[PDB]
Design a protein around this nucleic acid. Structure first.
Lengths: 90, 16
DNA sequence: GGTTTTTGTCTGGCTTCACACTTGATTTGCATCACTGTG
DNA sequence: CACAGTGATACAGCCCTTAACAAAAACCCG
DNA sequence: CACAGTGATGCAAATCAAGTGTGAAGCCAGACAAAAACC
DNA sequence: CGGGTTTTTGTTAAGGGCTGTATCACTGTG
């Protein structure tokens, strides 16, 4: 049977395509980086993203991994609402 | 074996 | 029928999130109020 | 020399690919 | 029976902070085992 | 004390693509 799209696969039915490769992922990380896998995959995915010119999603991933930037200060919210000539209902 | 020195291997998240 | 893909399971053991109660203590939501403005 | 808009357009700037080379910082040991 | 604002006020409702011991879920191991779409 | 080794960081140029900013004749309270 012909293959399907990688993203449409379930959480379990997509291991037979990464089984051959994640083993060299760990051995490379062990012999060069020290043993970290999440970090060495994160840097690889950042490489792919910024090569693909998707810096917006790259920065979003960086924010998710680091401290979340969600939430504005009340002072800056008021500054926006006032200096953009906005009304309370809008 | 003899140690040849070199720059220490910093954590991969702390490089450029 | 072959071939490849797609899901299913196995038990011991690990982490990770939700909850069981209760009493306040906030924080968010939405309706009220008499009015404008284009005629 | 009023000063903050008003929106469309065009140009500059910055960041990825190839691959080999070059300036520079951190230990090791004679 | 025009309809979208206009902002302050006030009360109903949602979320939570405190305490620890649970349940419930996701996943790791490597391996064995059934459905299903093209020849 | 300084080569030697390992690693970091930048550089060279032809292209592609996203983002940022200057420029144009005008407004409006008078």
């Amino acid at each position: 049977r012909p293959r399907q799209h990688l993203l449409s696969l379930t959480r379990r039915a997509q291991k037979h395509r990464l089984r051959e490769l994640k083993i060299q992922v760990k051995e490379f990380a062990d012999k060069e980086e020290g043993g970290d896998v999440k970090a060495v995959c994160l840097t690889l995915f950042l490489l792919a993203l910024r090569a693909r010119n998707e810096h917006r999603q790259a920065d979003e991933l960086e924010a998710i991994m680091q401290g979340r930037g969600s939430g504005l200060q009340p002072a800056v919210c008021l500054a926006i609402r006032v200096n953009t000539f906005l009304s309370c209902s809008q | 074996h003899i140690n040849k020195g070199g720059r220490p291997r910093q954590h991969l998240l702390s490089l450029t």
